[PDB]
Design a protein around this ligand. Structure first.
Ligand SMILES: *[C@@H]1O[C@H](CO)[C@@H](O[C@@H]2O[C@H](CO)[C@@H](O[C@@H]3O[C@H](CO)[C@@H](O)[C@H](O)[C@@H]3O)[C@H](O)[C@H]2NC(C)=O)[C@H](O)[C@H]1NC(C)=O
Ligand SMILES: *[C@@H]1O[C@H](CO)[C@@H](O[C@@H]2O[C@H](CO)[C@@H](O[C@@H]3O[C@H](CO)[C@@H](O)[C@H](O)[C@@H]3O)[C@H](O)[C@H]2NC(C)=O)[C@H](O)[C@H]1NC(C)=O
Ligand SMILES: *[C@@H]1O[C@H](CO)[C@@H](O[C@@H]2O[C@H](CO)[C@@H](O[C@@H]3O[C@H](CO)[C@@H](O)[C@H](O)[C@@H]3O)[C@H](O)[C@H]2NC(C)=O)[C@H](O)[C@H]1NC(C)=O
Ligand SMILES: *[C@@H]1O[C@H](CO)[C@@H](O[C@@H]2O[C@H](CO)[C@@H](O[C@@H]3O[C@H](CO)[C@@H](O)[C@H](O)[C@@H]3O)[C@H](O)[C@H]2NC(C)=O)[C@H](O)[C@H]1NC(C)=O
Lengths: 542, 542
């Protein structure tokens, strides 16, 4: 089977709860065959952790980083290809690494099926117990490298021989762990490339990546160019063919989209469709339609980059943004005065505390492509009416924990007030530990969530009974879907009648009372003061 | 140099004035190197006509048809390639021809530089004097054929030998006319393809079309695939490159558009830009922006195909059309009752005369991509107010005569009344022989014409003095650009003040009189009856 993971880019971050970190890693990689990004295998103190969530990973597009891993036996039993499209280093001066194993206590690291590292280097740095790596002939695997990089200091067990049957080095004990060869055992005429046997003629294709199962093209393990239901192509079958006689772009029933070095019938949901390609953002002159990048009309909607943490120093950059291309994180430090730390742990600028009032800058925001994360605490930070015009959170990017698209945790909020929020396209709702927050438990989140597989974790906010005793419940004019707050304009869906954007029992409860259907009103024209449509009761002028 | 002609598709039509036909042919092909379409060389009765307008034609994409040509010597001195993307036949059962010479009295037909007919056959049919064609070894030229097709009946001069120096056949006298060979004299290893010399190894490229000047690719005479400032490519450099790491379509500074088998920096004006291709129409879901096919918004503008001649039977198909993709021809037969004739001259359906009133169907038309041609006569057909909302004639297709985009000839019109017409994008204005038509001579046509090279032929309508004596002149509120008719809403540009779409001396001449600039008014809000902006004179209500 084939299944896609989004990789991570946390580099050397230390998780607080190492147990949730485990859960996160597990939830992320289980049954995944293909990592879009970097596989970061980090901080697993227990020696006997079961890492079988790694069991189906076949290819990684970025780098593999193994840091602070003390599980005795760490095996990647099906990993074949590390592409190294993005690489890892401790610093600017260090080598760029596709495989980096560092500060880990594992006794073995087994990748018996590993074939090829397409780009970057292999490094081992201060792993006290790791065995066999020097028996591995690395120029067999590393495409642009001689050997692995080793480093040991700070003060070394004797180490077992490879299995009887190995012709050369191994990744560990038993015959399954003997290094195989598909590049060094080949003859020339192969000009250094891979092959499925010793003799000439049988040198894979040229397009092949990681080697091959037979003669050519349809027989590759993976591809140096585009990969298409099994065959390597120089390009994906375009979505339309140009007929040079007729001057027509005829649509192609076998056309496909380029997603990375992959040809695909539809772009994965975390990317948009631009021409024949799956892309991360629309270009400057385009906008997002139905998941498709398309020329605009008037001015294009003012769209702004997200920031990694909101604070006094960067909040004004969202002035007039309609769409935010990225995430929004409002944290404690947002309010208390955010402090730049740099890698070398040299203190950067520090910004003044943020006055929640300034959050009003978001009132023009209609879309967030990433996620929205709220964690801060402030006396005057009591709701999300700042986002009263936000109508969709795409979640094309999710949080490290629980695949969250909306996470509200340990905040000082009393109500949401996000009256326009209609879709959370992807990912989950986490709303926990907000000591004064009501409403969230009576909101039917699946209503606004697009998929059934999307999840809801909403608890340990304000106890149901203690909201009810303050009247901080829904207006009796909301249906059972709940509300963002006590307002009549705060319902998800309306029980009786909806008018103007507010919610009424009658439709007759007001001067103008023209009914448009089962549930709806509308104003009685400029001229009527009272009507039901051309004609009415208490008239006006011209 | 390089210059592009649009070819014709008139097949065997007989022109009335054979002298204007000559002029037309001349104006069409002079200095052209490349025919986009068919070269139709027809009906040239005089024996001593100078056909030097053919002198630079290098390649034709469609077919060459020579019919009723009695010029003694007809030479194509630089023609190299007939592609035969579209072919000619007298009927369904006949062969499909890329070169067809028929019912012509020429003594010779000289194409000394002809190399290759890429597709279709070569035919000679009832040419009484034509010489040398049987000496030409045709399998040298015809890619998918044995020999030329001959036919002679209806009742043959003796014919001169080729020049002393010819190794084989010729197109006529003198050493310049000896057939050259670049396909038959080649060895194999060439597998039947062309070459620049006898020995193996030197077999052109494979992409080459018509042969080659040296070894390979950059050395082709022309291309079987795309042609790019001189080199044959399997595809044009795309306009954006997809970066598979970053998931971005990066724009390509060396990208180009596909125009036929041609790569080009910009689409010729008779085509639009759709993705990387130059196209004839936008697809169903797109529309025309700045010469670019682009997704729509609301419903796409209702756009309808043109018809070859307007008449009672097809007029309703334009119900609600906003854009007409094609031409509009209103002819005498439109009004008198149009009669279908078929090739075999069997009478088709006949439609009832057309009541000009029905022309009102065009009132929604804002754009005509082709040309607009008006020739009919009817007592009640007195102006073009039917087209009162037409704002641009693109002229992406022009008339056979004078490159006309707007032609009004021998019509019963008194005035135009096309108050919204702002652009004739391409081609010319011909307005001649309308016995009762005024205005047209005082309209500054260059105002609405986009290019300076565009031309104006406006004469022999109603004599200037005889319009003036009926008051059928411009309102004294138009500037010197003239008008479409006597209305105040009929000026091209306004002298004093423009308001609502009509034209006034004062701006004060009316109840509401708020001035927005040097020349403009606007209504005084719902509430004022008299103002100048918030405040005014004779007020109203709420
Ligand atoms: C601690 O860490 C930070 C960054 O990790 C250091 O600040 C950075 O200093 C570097 C030089 O190492 C700056 O690079 C320079 O960039 C400019 C403009 O792009 C260029 O003209 C120079 O040639 C140079 O390459 C960089 O801008 C700056 N970055 C940041 C984010 O401040 C800092 O100096 C380190 N502190 C200590 C005590 O070592
Ligand atoms: C949802 O949150 C919004 C934004 O915080 C709340 O509206 C704000 O309510 C506060 C507290 O009552 C207002 O503070 C006052 O401002 C006035 C003049 O602006 C000042 O003179 C007072 O002494 C006081 O500081 C604030 O103005 C008001 N902001 C806006 C933009 O309306 C709203 O109360 C929240 N909804 C609920 C149910 O809490
Ligand atoms: C005179 O000329 C016209 C056309 O040039 C002839 O009318 C055409 O008759 C043909 C058969 O020769 C029709 O083709 C048929 O088309 C249908 C549907 O597409 C198909 O099912 C049949 O197998 C057949 O191929 C064609 O529709 C029709 N075209 C038009 C425009 O009327 C006409 O019959 C000729 N008259 C004489 C006296 O020979
Ligand atoms: C521009 O051409 C339009 C369209 O032909 C002219 O408007 C038309 O004027 C004619 C002749 O006066 C009108 O005919 C009359 O129609 C009425 C009722 O519709 C009928 O009862 C009369 O006995 C007579 O047949 C016609 O209605 C009118 N059409 C429209 C759509 O307004 C207009 O006169 C032309 N402008 C100039 C300066 O000629």
């Amino acid at each position: 089977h084939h299944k896609i993971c989004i990789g991570t880019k946390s580099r050397l971050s230390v998780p607080s709860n190492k147990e949730h970190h485990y859960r996160n890693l597990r939830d992320r990689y289980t049954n995944c065959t293909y990592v879009d990004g970097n596989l970061e295998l980090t901080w697993l103190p227990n020696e006997n952790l079961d890492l079988s969530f790694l069991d189906n990973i076949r290819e990684v597009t970025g780098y593999i980083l193994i840091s602070h891993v003390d599980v005795k036996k760490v095996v990647f039993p099906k990993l074949q290809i590390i592409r190294g499209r993005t690489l890892f280093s401790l610093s600017v001066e260090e080598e760029k690494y596709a495989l980096f194993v560092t500060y880990s206590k594992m006794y073995t690291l087994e990748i018996p099926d590993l074939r090829d590292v397409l780009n970057g280097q292999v490094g081992f740095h201060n792993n006290y117990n790791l065995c066999h790596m020097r028996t591995i002939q690395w120029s067999e695997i590393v495409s642009n490298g001689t050997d692995a990089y080793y480093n040991y200091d700070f003060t070394e067990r004797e180490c077992p021989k490879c299995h009887e049957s190995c012709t050369h080095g191994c990744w560990g004990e038993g015959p399954k762990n003997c290094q195989k060869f598909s590049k060094l055992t080949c003859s020339p005429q192969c000009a250094g490339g891979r092959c499925y046997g010793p003799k000439p003629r049988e040198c894979c294709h040229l397009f092949c990546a990681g080697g091959c199962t037979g003669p050519t093209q349809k027989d590759c393990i993976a591809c140096k160019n585009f990969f298409d239901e099994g065959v390597c192509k120089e390009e994906c079958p375009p979505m339309r063919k140009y007929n040079p006689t007729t001057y027509v772009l005829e649509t192609n029933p076998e056309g496909k989209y380029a997603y990375g070095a992959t040809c695909v019938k539809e772009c994965p949901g975390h990317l948009l469709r631009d021409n024949g390609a799956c892309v991360r953002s629309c270009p400057q002159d385009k906008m997002d339609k139905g998941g498709e990048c398309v020329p605009c009309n008037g001015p294009c909607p003012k769209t702004c980059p997200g920031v990694t943490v909101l604070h006094a120093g960067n909040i004004d950059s969202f002035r007039n943004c309609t769409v935010i291309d990225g995430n929004i994180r409002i944290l404690d430090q947002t309010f208390s005065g955010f402090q730049d730390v740099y890698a070398n742990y040299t203190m950067g600028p520090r910004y003044i505390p943020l006055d929640p009032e300034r959050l009003e800058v978001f009132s023009t925001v209609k879309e967030i492509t990433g996620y929205l994360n709220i964690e801060g605490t402030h006396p005057q930070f009591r709701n999300l009416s700042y986002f009263r015009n936000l109508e969709t959170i795409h979640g094309r990017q999710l949080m490290e924990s629980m695949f969250a698209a909306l996470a509200i945790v340990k905040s000082s909020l009393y109500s949401l007030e996000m009256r326009n929020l209609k879709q959370i396209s992807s990912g989950s709702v986490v709303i926990q530990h907000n000591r004064d927050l009501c409403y969230v438990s009576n909101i039917r989140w699946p209503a606004i969530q697009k998929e059934p597989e999307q999840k809801v974790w909403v608890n340990e906010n304000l106890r149901a009974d203690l909201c009810e005793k303050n009247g901080t419940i829904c207006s009796d004019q909301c249906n059972e879907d709940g509300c963002w707050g006590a307002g009549t304009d705060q319902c998800l869906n309306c029980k009786n009648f909806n008018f103007n954007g507010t919610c009424i029992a009658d439709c007759g409860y007001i001067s103008n009372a023209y009914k448009f259907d089962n549930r709806t009103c509308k104003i009685c024209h400029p001229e009527c003061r009272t009507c039901n449509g051309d004609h009415c009761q208490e008239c006006v002028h011209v």
